[PDB]
């Protein structure tokens, strides 16, 4: 019963680890679907202003060096090959995004091509969209495994 | 008992939506202190772009509206802990939007942002001091539902 207290534990550790990174993902997403094209509006809301979304793939790119880094803190032999497969995959996106400069990495990023790198349900989606999918995709298979592995703890 | 265990998983469901709110946190700060008049790289990393930060504002003013739902959705112990939290983001979303004229432009300045989203900003005085707040109370409300876990495991 000593063991259940600790095992208990340290696995709700990795669940908390990754709801972090679930949840800076969720971040992306909310840019993504509402800020694009957008500023802040007079009594609330946000107001159409198409055209100046090269500040907010600055922060998208950083959130997505976020990903990566939280993706290295976590070390289970169980959850070693879908850790590892998450981290592929964040780094894929934040390089993706990257070869896509001329385009994302200028100030007048225009909204069809800002929802092309970050909106994952965008149609073309190939300037890094695809890749933010797939990263969606391996956090999610890493959740489901670490939050079954807290259930057989409990 | 086995009725502990049925603490144990309604205490930890507290503790990941309180994470998930301290991550929301950590976004808008990794947005404040990486992002603004920033643009995606060559090669990798970030360059300088001063101002047009208008649509990253949007971002953050998204963000800090999905903080406010996420605490709406939170346990009679916590109650006054919640309700200031929930108060506090609401005080910073009014705040952000009351700066419309500086805020809710194309080219909001760094100046201009950084005062808005960046805690560590010296003036600090269109948003930056609720977000302070808000983080304060948030964190305060995470020590107390990882002690209420942590009273349940043992």
């Given amino acids: 019963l000593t063991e259940i207290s600790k095992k208990i534990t340290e696995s709700n550790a990795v669940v908390l680890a990754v709801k972090e990174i679930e949840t800076l993902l969720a971040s992306i997403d909310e840019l993504a679907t509402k800020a694009i094209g957008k500023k802040i509006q007079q009594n609330g809301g946000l107001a159409v202003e198409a055209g100046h979304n090269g500040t907010l793939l600055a922060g ?89 592995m807290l259930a057989n703890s409990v």
Avoid: P, R
């Fill in 60 to 148: 998208a790119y950083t959130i997505s060096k976020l990903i990566t880094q939280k993706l290295d803190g976590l070390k289970s032999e169980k959850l070693k090959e879908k850790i590892e497969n998450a981290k592929k995959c964040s780094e894929d996106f934040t390089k993706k995004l990257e070869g896509e400069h001329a385009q994302l990495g200028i100030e007048n990023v225009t909204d069809e091509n800002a929802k092309k790198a970050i909106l994952i349900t965008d149609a073309a989606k190939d300037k890094g969209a695809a890749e933010l999918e797939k990263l969606f995709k391996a956090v999610e298979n890493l959740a489901k495994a670490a939050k079954e």
